[PDB]
Design a protein around this ligand. Structure first.
Ligand SMILES: [Ca+2]
Length: 72
């Protein structure tokens, strides 16, 4: 329980950098580049399923509360 504010706030700081337009929404691929910022690089299949999460080829949208719920 002690760990949270640091990580939570840390994740938010990343979103700010990822969201240049601060539209509160980001693509789907940028999510992978976010996990790396955690010091640990992603595998390949884990991010693969995410790309399909778009359900469509078009560019999907993900909010801060939608991205976090995914990264868990
Ligand atoms: Ca954005």
């Amino acid at each position: 329980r002690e760990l949270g504010p640091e990580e939570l706030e840390e994740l938010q700081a990343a979103f700010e950098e990822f969201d240049t337009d601060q539209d509160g929404y980001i693509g789907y691929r940028e999510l992978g580049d976010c996990m790396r910022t955690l010091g640990y690089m992603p595998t390949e299949m884990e991010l693969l399923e995410v790309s399909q999460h778009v359900k469509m080829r078009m560019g999907g949208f993900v909010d801060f509360e939608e991205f976090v719920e995914l990264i868990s």
